[PDB]
Every structure is written in structure tokens, then in C-alpha cells.
Design a protein around this nucleic acid. Structure first.
Ligand SMILES: C[C@H](CCC(=O)NCCC[N+](C)(C)C[C@H](O)CS(=O)(=O)O)[C@H]1CC[C@H]2[C@@H]3[C@H](O)C[C@@H]4C[C@H](O)CC[C@]4(C)[C@H]3C[C@H](O)[C@]12C
Ligand SMILES: C[C@H](CCC(=O)NCCC[N+](C)(C)C[C@H](O)CS(=O)(=O)O)[C@H]1CC[C@H]2[C@@H]3[C@H](O)C[C@@H]4C[C@H](O)CC[C@]4(C)[C@H]3C[C@H](O)[C@]12C
Ligand code: 118
Ligand SMILES: [Mg+2]
Lengths: 35, 1339
RNA sequence: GCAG
């Protein structure tokens, strides 16, 4: 995709971090129940 | 005249009558800052515009807002001199009235739930003094005007300097005042590309697709269509005949008839006119005329819905057939005729990989923020934050003016952000320039460069500070504490004040002021600078920006500029140059209406100046206005040529219009080479003020202007009579004409005595007027440094002979007599401030004391019991001025020192002598001591003595101002009381304080008595509240730096006399170092016995062709020849009739001069006073480029009974026999420059060594050590000096164990070295091994 | 800012 076009570590962190969709109010409850 | 100009009238040789007096020379600085801080209800200038640019500040949700109502500057805490003493900025508090509006929660408007209006303090802004300076941290700084490229669109080229084909490549560049640059350019394949902030380039149609244009709309914008319409058969083609200018048709043209041009024949304008005479609108061409033609529309099918040919698709006969089958009898097609309408846009529509707006926004995102995945909602926000939001892009008002002016629009005002129209018009003009119907902009034209000055840079920095605070107040307004906070609880003054603090103290353009003489000040203020923030860099600045342009004429001095690495980047404003309201320089001209030169002046900018044709100033004209010639030299386009007298549109307003103020002071500037004129202009500003200022015998006439328009002098604000005059003050009793009702009518001028300039010279004012003398508004009352009776005087009138003398003036040396040293001619006072800082250390505090260890009581004889030197002490180098000891520990005696002290019992001391001493070679007088004590430290006897002296002085000064002012009030009351109901026998005995309440017959005079009594009561109320303020400012503790307990500043005054090594100069670039101070009897002498004061080398004239210095000599001998004539008439005590006749014969000399001195209107007292001021030589005025001709110099030489060749015969003083040839003897004006040999001589055997690498320290302030650079090492390798070199490397410099062995070896008488390894090589080895690289030394 |  966009891989290889930047070397900035903050751009790389944000780009890799944004691939994880947020949790809803009942998503956190499900994950805590799993823990 | 005057009364201060008929004391000594300078004989003017200028012939052109002047129509425009020289303006206020500091208008740039004062006007700029006045625009910055003044209240502006229109809201365009300074703080008001900056506040309206940021406020109102809505919340993120809009529930509340912070709006701005008004601002106001407080009064400064300290006046200018207290700021220079206490070392603090001279500033005024900015108090701004804000209002926090809280809307409601549920409301149709958000109606006001509350308003909280209060006045929040944000920052202190520095204040320009009344001379155009700023006192920032106690030093006077000048903020230099910047010369930067105007915002706007600039079309340029590189003139075939790429791809070796010699192809000129064009580029437009949109430069805003703030925001992202936007360039369009051509590549060698004729494809329009675009760059944003100079990062990698995209095809230019991507920025056209980010704006919502399709390919069809793009081809609509940049092109026009040749319409092919299918009538009955055979491909009829609509014809516009001018599209057929200059081609070779592949086919003959037959329209309903006559064949116009056969196949392969070229078409000329006769054929176009013939086709339009026939009114040809239709052709039928061969079918392969569409082999290469590009369709200009989206042509789809109606039968099968297939998209046959979209836009920008090159056609062919098969495509033509499949396109005609769908009922498409209309074929729109691009008209691209070669060499006048290129395919550039339709060619780039093929090079960009983009098809739609969203893909273009994605491509711009990928270029701008690479490596980050572009989403739609961020790519379409980045673009409309690039050039289309006022928060991020301001093309400004100058930007929009230059922008529309470049695209030939008629509106000069608009929005500050770009538009579709602006970008498209820029592309159209770039394409026009490619098609040969435009011209690129000259980027060094002074219509493209703009003066950005103090009040604009200061506003820019203030507005940067304002956005810094408003982001935080937006962050704070969206919190939920919103009901109980006031606006000053969310404003942080520290960012706002830090922006202006770093601007005024740390900017490149905020400079330590040159304060040598008045000329240095007033030319540092009129200084233009290409450098600075937002401008060039002196290394990367090319050859072409450093050159003098044809639009510098009258706007920027060509000659006054530096000489080193920033030449042509630091410029000086010309004498009459102004700035536009936009910042572009403009200069005045006289209008030539019909061949009559009017005296109506118009300030023309650099672009307007190129439209008209403009006569010279040396262009002759008679008293009717008409040019006495008919073929006049003029300038019309920057080109200069000859024109008729009825083509002439304007005329230069003065002959010195073209040069700066510092170059306006070189007499006979028109005879110097421009290099030597540059050097003279630059060495007039380094000339230190001598003891007794001496007017130039040969000036130009700008000396009065430079001396007054710089604030070094004390000019009378209202005219009057000198009531009291004294070496430290002048009390002027105003005329009754000029004083206001209800006023004392007295002006006190407190002169400045023996203060330090920034260059450690002394700036001292002497009263010029004498007691009881009538002065007028504008007369000079006090001569500052380097002024003589109001005329700028930078050097002394020395008697030079031009002759080689026995080797002593070889290669620019100067041989001075001894009478120049006896007479204290070039002796200058220099004042040094030396501070001793008692700090708090970790082993105890340092204390200022007279009980200094290891120092005899002979050295402490000048210190008083407080440990500080006595004021008035004659000190020399090595003397203790401020005795101070430091507590010390970690004693750790050696075994031998332990035995030595167990033998004699003289124990070690627990304090270390840290005294302040006079630097070596300095010898002077303590003239001032200032003691600053941190509040909480007890004052010693001397700080209390100094405080009590200051309180005595404050009370004495304010009681004396009240005495003078109340004496003036009582004299005015006495004058009004005797105007009716005269009490002349009664008034002088009654107690004066009852005159305040003596009720008289009130016709209207008791009203004036009411106002005069109110004035006296107010003066009595005001003196007390000024004295209490002064007491509480004197006795208050000082805000010292953290750590310091007290600071003792001692001021030495050093009289430096002239001596071999001191660098003297003249006004013509003839600098020189004094080689010998020759006895009087050794100097060459003329037949009367008068020896020469200075012997110069004649070989310094003909190669460096500053011939002016010869003429100023010949004229300076004429002038003195008049003086020593008048002098004779004052020693024989001739009648004033004979004196009046001779001085009139001297002032009437010259061929058609502009001045007439008719001194039959002078009284005998005035003639004798003038003749007394002319007895040291009659001062001449030689205006620049208008000066005294050679014949006038010879005529004045003949009047003084001197030889008209200017060359007398001299005798050798040593052998008494005549030099075999006549010798040019006259009076030059020699300047003593600030490069004194006392300050340059340095020597060091051993000293302090640098910390990391163990080499000697750098400069003569730290006891130095000279750098044996790389080139000197080569010079020793070029001889075979291996041992000298090896000791320069090891034992003189870096060898830590070898330098001490070498020292003790020299002291032992054994000149032998034991060299080791330089320590810096070990530093290098350890700094490479810390890189993960194993560097070793192989045994 | 400057000096050569
Ligand atoms: C009112 C006046 C003439 C009408 C217009 C025309 C040119 C404008 C100035 C320039 O744009 C430079 C600068 C831009 C900053 O953004 C704001 C300050 C400056 C000084 C502007 C102020 C004001 O707007 C000016 C003087
Ligand atoms: C001649 C003139 C008007 C009559 C009188 C009225 C006020 C008098 C001055 C003040 O007293 C202050 C001061 C006192 C010192 O002692 C001597 C100098 C000063 C400047 C005086 C000079 C002179 O005496 C003044 C100007
Ligand atoms: C960084 C960038 C440019 C230069 Sb130069 C220069 C050098 C000394 C004094 C003034 C200028 C330079 C560059 C462009 C246009 C004009 C001058 C420079 C470059 C090569 C060789 C010698 C000097 C030096 C450092
Ligand atoms: Mg520098």
C-alpha cells in the first residue's frame, strides 16, 4: 500500500495504529469479560 | 537665515536652486512604529489590526466567545535613561479590554447568558524612543528595515540552463505573505507541472482537478475549438480565418469558388484578409486533416450508449467513422496551432494518472503527507487548508495588489486567499509567456521588492504571539468551568510577550546600534537589508541580487554598501526616498507640464518611473522653467538616452537625489571612483568624536541636516531668549508669541554629559548658545558629539602636503606631525564600564571588601573602606577597582608547602582574591560608580553614600525645575497684572504668593490669572509627586539576576591620543595608518615657516582614482586662505567697513551660485561675530554633483592671495633646502577611525586553555592565542620547517604534558621540546571509537 | 554588524 514512502517513525506509528477500529460501550464489556 | 546660521555662514557653491528640502531623515523608523502602536479606528495598522485578525475567539462548540473591545498602552515604569542604567527594556504595558460572552444553552440565537468585561494585561511592547531606537536590555538597538520580495505572482525563467539544449524553461510562482508557495513550471517536453512548497512536482492539471473542473471544463478553459460540422458530406469545417495565420496548408482552399492557396504553399496575412473579404466561414478539407486532432468534448453513443470518444482523445478516421454513425454531425475539436497556441494543457492531461477530483486530492495528499494512507475526508481538508482558508493562507493587501497587477486586473483589492480564478489566470499567463506573448518579471526590480519595516515586523511577531495565546484560549473555552471564570484567567501574557521579546532582542534585524558619531546612528536607521528572517542569506545570495539595478536610481544608494561578504545586501536609503503605503520605494520628481518644469513634486514608484521619460538634475534650465537646451539627457525605461524637450515628463528633484545621506557628505563625490566613494562613505561612519569638534572647511551642505535630524543635538522646541545657560542645562525664556495661555513659558534643556556610547566613546553635549542670546524654533542650543555649531563635524582640518617623505608614507601610511599631538587634535575620550558581580556561591557568598589577602596596602590605597574605588581616582592597568574575595575550600597543600608553612607560620587564607582590576594597558579616571544591591542584602557604606547622593540630586533637580518654572510663572503674572491696574510701585514689595489670589478688575484678564494660578498650584502639586516617585525609585532594591548579590559598575574615562598604528582616513576612501609622529622641525615647511601637519603619499591618488581628495585639498587651501586673511584683519584691528567689504567679496565669489549673502543687512555686531567665526578658515559648501568647479576654486585661491595651481614650494625641515618641485599643500579633513592600535595589540605567552580540546582560548578578551590556521601550516610545510611546525602543533598548543615541560625548560635555559601527542588527536580517537569504529595505534 |  503506502509501505516504503516514509521513514518518519511517527507517521509509521499512526498509520499502523489506525488499522484497529475503536470499541463501543458494549465492546469494552465483552473484552473485559474475556479477560 | 537664522540666528544660528548667520553666526557662521557656509559659502555655498551649488548652482542648482533647490525645490525640495531634505526630509526628516528618520521618517522610516518613526512612521513605521507610529503605525504600529497608534490607535487606528479603521483597523488596518498595528495592534488594532492584529487584534481584529485574531479576535473574536469562538469556542469549539460556539457556546461562548472572547471578543475584544479596545487596547491601551500603559505608561513606562522607567524612562529611557533609567532603562539604560538598570539594564531593562524600555517598554509600555499593553492592557487590552476583553469581554467573555456566555451564551445560553437552549436559545434560538444563543442569547447572552452573561457578559464579563475586564481589562487583561498581555505583554509589554517595547517603545521607540524619540530618535528611532529601542532600549532593549539597556542597550540601544535599531531594528533595520528589510527588503524582501513582495508577495504576488512572479513569472521567471531559467535561460536554457537545463538539459543542454538551451531551452528557456518558464515558471510562475505564487508567493503569499503567509502560507504555502505554489509554483507552476514547464519541463523540457513542454508539460506544465506544479509544486507546492517546493516539494516534488505533479502534473499541473491535478491542481485543476482538485478544484472541481472536469477534463471537459479544463479543455474549455485553456482552449478554443475548431468546430467540424458534418453537413451533406465531405467533412465541412467551420473557419475562423485568423486561426490560419502563418502556416503551410497540406491542401488547397476552395470555398464556393476561387482557390486561395494551393497545396503546400505558405499562408500570409494577405490570404487571411482575402478569406475574410470573401467572408469564408466554411471549408471542406481532406479527411486526413483529422489525423492528430484532439477532440474537445465527451462524445458518446445514443444507440449503444458506448462512450465513443471522451475529451482529450486524439482522433483518427476510424474513430471519425464510428463517431459519425451515432448521429454526431457536430465534432468539436481543439485548436492548437503550433508556436502560438501550444498543446501544453492537453499534453499534460495525458501525463497525469488522475481521472477525477477525489483521485487528484488523493495524489496531492500523497505528495504532501507521504507514507500515510489518504482518506477522503482528510485529503479534501488538506487542500482547502492549503490555499483557501484565511487561517493558513494570507496573500495580504500587497499580495493581492501585485497579484491583480500582474494579471492585468483593474481591481487592486480583494480576498487574501486564492481562488479558482486566480490559479487559472496564473496558468493562463504562464502559457501566454510560453507562447511568446508575455515577458518574465525581473526579480530584482524595485517594483518587485518591498520595504518591510519596524512597525510591520513587530506587528507580525505580535500576531504570532496572539495566535499562540488564542489556541490556548480556544482550548480553555471549551471546558465546563465556563460560568465562574473571568477573561484574565484564560489569557497567558507570557507567549505574547515572549514573541515580541525574542523579536526585539534576538532577531537578525534587531541590531546593536552604531553610535560612533551622529552619522553612524542616522545611517544605521536608514538602512535597508536583504537579509533577515524571510529574506536572503549572505552565502546563498547570488551575483544578481547584489548588483545595482536601474530602479535603484534615487531609491537606494549605489555606493554606500558594505564591502565584505554582504555587499549589495545591506543597502542605504537615498536622501529623498520614501515608501509607498504598500512598502515599495518611491522618489520625488518635478512635473514638466509643457516644457516648463513645474515645482510640483510627485512621488514615483519604480514601475511608474519606467513609463515616463525623466530629465536629469544636471539638465540646465532658465528662470522661466524651460530647458535651455532642446536635446535633453533623460531616462525612459531604465535605458538612458537623449530626448526632445517636449518628450520630457518629469525631472529629478535634486542633484543629490541618487546618493544616500552618508555619501551626500563627500565633497567632490563626482570626481571619486565609485570604489573609493564607497570606502569614504563607509569610513565616515567609523570616525570617533574628538575632543573639540572642528567643522569641515569643505563640506557639502548636508552637515546641518545630519546633525539636527539625528538627536545628538539639543534643538530649541520654541524660540526665545536664553535665560540661563550652563555646562549642563539651558533655560530658554520663550517668546510670548509661542507660549500657550496658563503656562510658565520656559523650556529647560538638560544636556547629556559624558555618557557611554555603544562603542565606548563618549556622547557629551556642550551648550552652543551664550547667555541672553535670542534663539528661534529650530536652532541648535547644544552641540552633541561630533557637531560644531549644529554642523556635523567628524574629523579635523589638517594641513596636508602630498609628497613622498623618506619612506614614512609608503603604501598608504600617514606621517603626522607632532603638533597634531600637542594640540590634542585627534585625542578622543573613551568610556568603559567594568562590572564586578558579587554572587552567591555554594561555599558561601562572595563579598566586596577592602581586606584583600596577599595584596599590600599600596594597591588598596585608592579603595575606600567599602572596598570600591574612589570616584575621580587616576587608575592604571593592574589597579584594584572593586575589592572582592571568594570563599574557597579544598585547600590540600603539597608536602613541601606544608613544610614551608610549618617553618614560617604564615597560614593560608580561606578567601581567594577575586577583585575587579583595570585591564592591562588601560589608564584612566574613574568617573562614575554604580552599585546595585539585591533586595535583602544589606548595603555597605558606599551604596548608602551613593543613594544619599542620588536622593540629594533628585531633590535638587526637581526643586530647581520648580524654581525656574515658578520664576517664569511669576514673571508672566507680573506681566499680566501690569496690563491693567498697574502696580509698578506696589507689585515688587507684596509677597509674590498673594499675586496668585489678587482679584483684579475682571474684563477678561482675571480668567488668565485663574489659569496662571491653576498652573502654579498644579506645579506645586506635581513637583511633590515627581519627587516621591524618584525617592521610591532610588531606594528600591534592584531586580538582579538570580544568584548575584550585588553589582558594582565602575566607569573609566580614557583619553586616547593619536599614535603610530591608529588608522586615519579622509572622506574619499583614502584610509591610512599613522607610521610616525614626526617632530615639528622635521616637517616640510613653506616660505613663511608654517610646517605641514600631515604628509600623504601622492602615489595613492592616481591608481585609485579618487581625484576628489586633491580638489578638496585645493579648495581647503582656498578656504583657509580666506580665513587667514580675515584673521589678519582682526589682528590689525581694521574697521568693520573693511572686514564687511572683504567678507562680502568672498561670499559673492563664484559663477552663478544659488545663495546671496548680502551682509549690508548685518549689524556691526553680527559682522564681527561672523568674522570671528571665519577667522579659522571660511567654510565652503560643495554640494554633491553640483559642486564648485575647478575655475571657482582657482578664483577663490586668487582671492586669498595663494597660488592658483594649489602647489606651493616647500622646504625640507631637516636640511632646510627646497624640494625640487612644487608640492600640493592644502587642508584636508582627516577622520580618526575607530580602529585604534590600543585595541588591536595583543600578546600571550601562556594562558587559559580550552576545555574539551586543550588548546589556547580564542580572543584577546580571554587572553587569546592566535590561530595557526591550515594555511600557515602549509606555509611551514613549504619551507622545510618541520621543527617549528611540530612545536606549533604539540607544545605551543595541545600537548598537555609537553607545554609545561617546555615552559620549565625555557625557564631553565634549555630550549628543547619533549613533544607528545596533541590532545585533540586523542579527542578525535575517542570520538571515532564512540561511533562503533575501532581506530587504533599500531605499535 | 565590521576590519584587511
Ligand atoms: C491599509 C493599507 C493601504 C490600503 C494596506 C495596504 C498594504 C497593507 C499592509 C501589507 O499588506 C503588509 C502587511 C500585511 C499584514 O498582513 C498586515 C500589516 C501590513 C503592513 C498591511 C497593513 C495594511 O493592510 C496595508 C498597509
Ligand atoms: C535669571 C532667572 C530668571 C530671573 C533665574 C530664575 C530662576 C533661576 C534658576 C533657579 O533658581 C534654579 C537654579 C538655581 C541655582 O542656584 C542657579 C541656577 C538656576 C538655574 C537659577 C538660575 C537663574 O538665577 C534663574 C534662571
Ligand atoms: C553556502 C552557500 C553558498 C556559498 Sb558562495 C559565498 C561564499 C563566500 C562569501 C559569499 C558567498 C555563492 C553561492 C551562490 C551565489 C553566489 C555565491 C561560493 C560557492 C562556490 C565557490 C565559492 C563561493 C557558500 C556557502
Ligand atoms: Mg556578522
Amino acid at each position: 500500500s503506502e509501505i516504503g514512502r516514509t521513514t518518519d517513525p511517527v507517521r509509521m506509528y499512526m498509520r499502523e495504529m489506525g488499522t484497529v477500529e475503536l470499541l463501543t460501550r458494549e465492546g469494552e464489556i465483552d473484552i473485559a469479560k474475556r479477560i | 537665515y537664522s540666528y544660528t546660521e548667520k553666526k557662521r555662514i557656509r559659502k555655498d557653491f551649488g548652482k542648482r536652486p533647490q525645490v525640495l528640502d531634505v526630509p526628516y531623515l528618520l521618517s522610516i523608523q518613526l512612521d513605521s512604529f507610529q503605525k504600529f502602536i497608534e490607535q487606528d479606528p479603521e483597523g488596518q495598522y498595528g495592534l488594532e489590526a492584529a487584534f481584529r485578525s485574531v479576535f473574536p475567539i469562538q469556542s469549539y462548540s460556539g457556546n461562548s466567545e472572547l471578543q475584544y473591545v479596545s487596547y491601551r498602552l500603559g505608561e513606562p515604569v522607567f524612562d529611557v535613561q533609567e532603562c539604560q542604567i538598570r539594564g531593562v527594556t524600555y517598554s509600555a504595558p499593553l492592557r487590552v479590554k476583553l469581554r467573555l460572552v456566555i451564551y445560553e444553552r437552549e436559545a434560538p440565537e444563543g442569547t447572552v447568558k452573561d457578559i464579563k468585561e475586564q481589562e487583561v494585561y498581555m505583554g509589554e511592547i517595547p517603545l521607540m524612543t524619540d530618535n528611532g531606537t529601542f532600549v532593549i536590555n539597556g542597550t540601544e538597538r535599531v531594528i533595520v528595515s528589510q527588503l524582501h520580495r513582495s508577495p504576488g505572482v512572479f513569472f521567471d525563467s531559467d535561460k536554457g540552463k537545463t538539459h543542454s539544449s538551451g531551452k528557456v524553461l518558464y515558471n510562475a510562482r505564487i508567493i503569499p505573505y503567509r502560507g504555502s508557495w505554489l509554483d507552476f513550471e514547464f519541463d523540457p517536453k513542454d508539460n506544465l507541472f506544479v509544486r507546492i512548497d517546493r516539494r516534488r512536482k505533479l502534473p499541473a492539471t491535478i491542481i485543476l482537478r482538485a478544484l472541481n473542473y472536469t477534463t471537459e471544463q479544463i479543455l474549455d478553459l485553456f482552449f478554443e475549438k475548431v468546430i467540424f460540422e458534418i453537413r451533406d458530406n465531405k467533412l465541412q469545417m467551420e473557419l475562423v480565418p485568423e486561426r490560419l495565420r502563418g502556416e503551410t496548408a497540406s491542401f488547397d482552399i476552395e470555398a464556393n469558388g476561387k482557390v486561395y492557396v494551393e497545396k503546400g504553399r505558405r499562408i500570409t496575412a494577405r490570404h487571411i484578409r482575402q478569406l475574410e473579404k470573401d467572408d469564408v466561414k466554411l471549408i471542406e478539407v481532406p479527411v486526413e486533416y483529422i489525423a492528430g486532432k484532439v477532440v474537445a468534448k465527451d462524445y458518446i453513443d445514443e444507440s449503444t450508449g458506448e462512450l465513443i470518444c471522451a475529451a482529450n482523445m486524439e482522433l483518427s478516421l476510424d474513430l471519425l467513422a464510428k463517431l459519425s454513425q451515432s448521429g454526431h454531425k457536430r465534432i468539436e475539436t481543439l485548436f492548437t496551432n503550433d508556436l502560438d497556441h501550444g498543446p501544453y494543457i492537453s499534453e499534460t492531461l495525458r501525463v497525469d494518472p488522475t481521472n477525477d477530483r477525489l483521485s487528484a486530492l488523493v495524489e496531492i495528499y500523497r505528495m504532501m503527507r507521504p507514507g500515510e494512507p489518504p482518506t477522503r475526508e482528510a485529503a479534501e481538508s488538506l487542500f482547502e487548508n492549503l490555499f483557501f482558508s484565511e487561517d493558513r493562507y494570507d496573500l495580504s493587501a500587497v499580495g493581492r495588489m501585485k497579484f491583480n497587477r500582474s494579471l492585468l486586473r483593474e481591481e487592486i483589492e480583494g480576498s487574501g486567499i486564492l481562488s479558482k480564478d486566480d490559479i487559472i489566470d496564473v496558468m493562463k499567463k504562464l502559457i501566454d509567456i510560453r507562447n511568446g506573448k508575455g515577458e518574465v518579471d525581473d526579480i530584482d526590480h524595485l517594483g518587485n521588492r518591498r520595504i518591510r519595516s519596524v512597525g510591520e515586523m513587530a506587528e507580525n511577531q505580535f500576531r504570532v504571539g496572539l495566535v499562540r495565546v488564542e489556541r490556548a484560549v480556544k482550548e480553555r473555552l471549551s471546558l465546563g468551568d465556563l460560568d465562574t471564570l473571568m477573561p484574565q484567567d484564560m489569557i497567558n501574557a507570557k507567549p505574547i510577550s515572549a514573541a515580541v521579546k525574542e523579536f526585539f532582542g534576538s532577531s537578525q534585524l534587531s541590531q546593536f546600534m552604531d553610535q560612533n558619531n551622529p552619522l553612524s546612528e542616522i545611517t544605521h536607521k536608514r538602512r535597508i537589508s536583504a537579509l533577515g528572517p524571510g529574506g536572503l542569506t549572505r552565502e546563498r545570495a547570488g551575483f544578481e541580487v547584489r548588483d545595482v539595478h536601474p530602479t535603484h536610481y534615487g531609491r537606494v544608494c549605489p555606493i554606500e554598501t558594505p564591502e565584505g561578504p554582504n555587499i549589495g545586501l545591506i543597502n542605504s536609503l537615498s536622501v529623498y526616498a520614501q515608501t509607498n503605503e504598500y512598502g515599495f520605494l518611491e522618489t520625488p520628481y518635478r512635473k514638466v507640464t509643457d516644457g516648463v518644469v513645474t515645482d510640483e513634486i510627485h512621488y514615483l514608484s519604480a514601475i511608474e518611473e519606467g513609463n515616463y521619460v525623466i530629465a536629469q538634475a544636471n539638465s540646465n534650465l532658465d528662470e522661466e522653467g524651460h530647458f535651455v537646451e532642446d536635446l535633453v539627457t533623460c531616462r525612459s525605461k531604465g535605458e538612458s538616452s537623449l530626448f526632445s524637450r517636449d518628450q520630457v515628463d518629469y525631472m529629478d528633484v535634486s542633484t543629490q537625489q541618487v546618493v544616500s545621506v552618508g555619501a551626500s557628505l563627500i565633497p567632490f563625490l563626482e570626481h571619486d571612483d565609485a570604489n573609493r566613494a564607497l570606502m569614504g562613505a563607509n569610513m565616515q561612519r567609523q570616525a570617533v568624536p574628538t575632543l573639540r569638534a572642528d567643522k569641515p572647511l569643505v563640506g557639502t551642505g548636508m552637515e546641518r541636516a545630519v546633525a539636527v535630524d539625528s538627536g545628538v543635538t539639543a534643538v530649541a522646541k520654541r524660540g526665545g531668549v536664553v535665560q540661563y545657560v550652563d555646562a549642563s542645562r539651558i533655560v530658554i525664556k520663550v517668546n510670548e508669541d509661542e507660549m500657550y495661555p496658563g503656562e510658565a513659558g520656559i523650556d529647560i534643556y538638560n544636556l547629556t554629559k559624558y555618557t557611554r556610547s555603544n562603542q565606548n566613546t563618549c556622547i557629551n553635549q556642550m551648550p552652543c548658545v551664550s547667555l541672553g542670546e535670542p534663539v528661534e524654533r529650530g536652532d541648535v542650543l547644544a552641540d552633541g558629539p561630533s557637531t560644531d555649531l549644529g554642523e556635523l563635524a567628524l574629523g579635523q582640518n589638517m594641513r596636508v602636503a602630498f609628497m613622498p617623505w623618506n619612506g614614512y608614507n609608503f603604501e598608504d601610511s600617514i606621517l603626522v606631525s607632532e603638533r597634531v599631538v600637542q594640540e590634542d587634535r585627534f585625542t578622543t575620550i573613551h568610556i568603559q564600564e567594568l562590572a564586578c558581580v558579587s554572587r552567591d556561591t555554594k561555599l558561601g557568598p562572595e563579598e566586596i571588601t577592602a581586606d584583600i589577602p596577599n595584596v599590600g596596602e599600596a594597591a588598596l590605597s585608592k579603595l575606600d573602606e567599602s572596598g570600591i574605588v574612589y570616584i575621580g581616582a587616576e587608575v592604571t592597568g593592574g589597579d584594584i577597582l572593586v575589592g572582592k574575595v571568594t570563599p574557597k575550600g579544598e585547600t590540600q597543600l603539597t608536602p613541601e608547602e606544608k613544610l614551608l608553612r610549618a617553618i614560617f607560620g604564615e597560614k593560608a587564607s580561606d578567601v581567594k582574591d577575586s577583585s575587579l582590576r583595570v585591564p592591562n594597558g588601560v589608564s584612566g579616571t574613574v568617573i562614575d560608580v554604580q552599585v546595585f544591591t539585591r533586595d535583602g542584602v544589606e548595603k555597605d557604606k558606599r551604596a548608602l553614600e551613593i543613594e544619599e547622593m542620588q536622593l540629594k540630586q533628585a531633590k535638587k533637580d526637581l526643586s530647581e525645575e520648580l524654581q525656574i518654572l515658578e520664576a517664569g510663572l511669576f514673571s508672566r503674572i507680573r506681566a499680566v497684572l501690569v496690563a491693567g491696574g498697574v502696580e509698578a510701585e506696589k507689585l515688587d514689595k507684596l509677597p509674590r504668593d498673594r499675586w496668585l489670589e489678587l482679584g483684579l478688575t475682571d474684563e477678561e484678564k482675571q480668567n488668565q490669572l485663574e489659569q496662571l494660578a491653576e498652573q502654579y498650584d498644579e506645579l506645586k502639586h506635581e513637583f511633590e509627586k515627581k519627587l516621591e516617585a524618584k525617592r521610591r525609585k532610588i531606594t528600591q532594591g534592584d531586580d538582579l539576576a538570580p544568584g548575584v548579590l550585588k553589582i558594582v559598575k565602575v566607569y573609566l574615562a580614557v583619553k586616547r591620543r593619536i599614535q603610530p598604528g591608529d588608522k586615519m582616513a579622509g572622506r574619499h576612501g583614502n584610509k591610512g595608518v599613522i607610521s610616525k609622529i614626526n617632530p615639528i622641525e622635521d616637517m616640510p615647511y613653506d616660505e613663511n615657516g608654517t610646517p605641514v601637519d600631515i604628509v600623504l603619499n601622492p602615489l595613492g591618488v592616481p591608481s585609485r582614482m579618487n581625484i576628489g581628495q586633491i580638489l578638496e585639498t585645493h579648495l581647503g587651501m582656498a578656504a583657509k586662505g580666506i580665513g587667514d586673511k580675515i584673521n589678519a584683519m582682526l589682528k590689525q584691528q581694521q574697521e568693520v567697513a573693511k572686514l564687511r567689504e572683504f567678507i562680502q567679496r568672498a561670499y559673492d565669489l563664484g559663477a552663478d551660485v544659488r545663495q546671496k549673502v548680502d551682509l549690508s543687512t548685518f549689524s556691526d555686531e553680527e559682522v564681527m561675530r561672523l568674522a570671528e567665526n571665519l577667522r579659522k578658515g571660511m567654510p565652503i559648501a560643495t554640494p554633491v554633483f553640483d559642486g564648485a568647479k575647478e575655475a571657482e576654486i582657482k578664483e577663490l585661491l586668487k582671492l586669498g592671495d595663494l597660488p592658483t595651481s594649489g602647489q606651493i614650494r616647500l622646504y625640507d625641515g631637516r636640511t632646510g633646502e627646497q624640494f625640487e618641485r612644487p608640492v600640493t599643500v592644502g587642508y584636508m579633513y582627516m577622520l580618526k577611525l575607530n580602529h585604534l592600535v590600543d585595541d588591536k595589540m595583543h600578546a600571550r605567552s601562556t594562558g587559559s586553555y580550552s576545555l574539551v580540546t586543550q588548546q589556547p582560548l580564542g580572543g584577546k578578551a580571554q587572553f587569546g592565542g592566535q590561530r595557526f590556521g591550515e594555511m600557515e601550516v602549509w606555509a611551514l610545510e613549504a619551507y622545510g620547517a618541520a621543527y617549528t611546525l611540530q612545536e606549533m602543533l604539540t607544545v605551543k598548543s595541545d600537548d598537555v604534558n609537553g607545554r609545561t615541560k617546555m615552559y620549565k625548560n625555557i625557564v631553565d635555559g634549555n630550549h628543547q621540546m619533549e613533544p607528545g601527542m596533541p590532545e585533540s588527536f586523542n579527542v578525535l580517537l575517542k570520538e571515532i571509537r564512540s561511533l562503533g569504529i575501532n581506530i587504533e595505534l599500531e605499535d
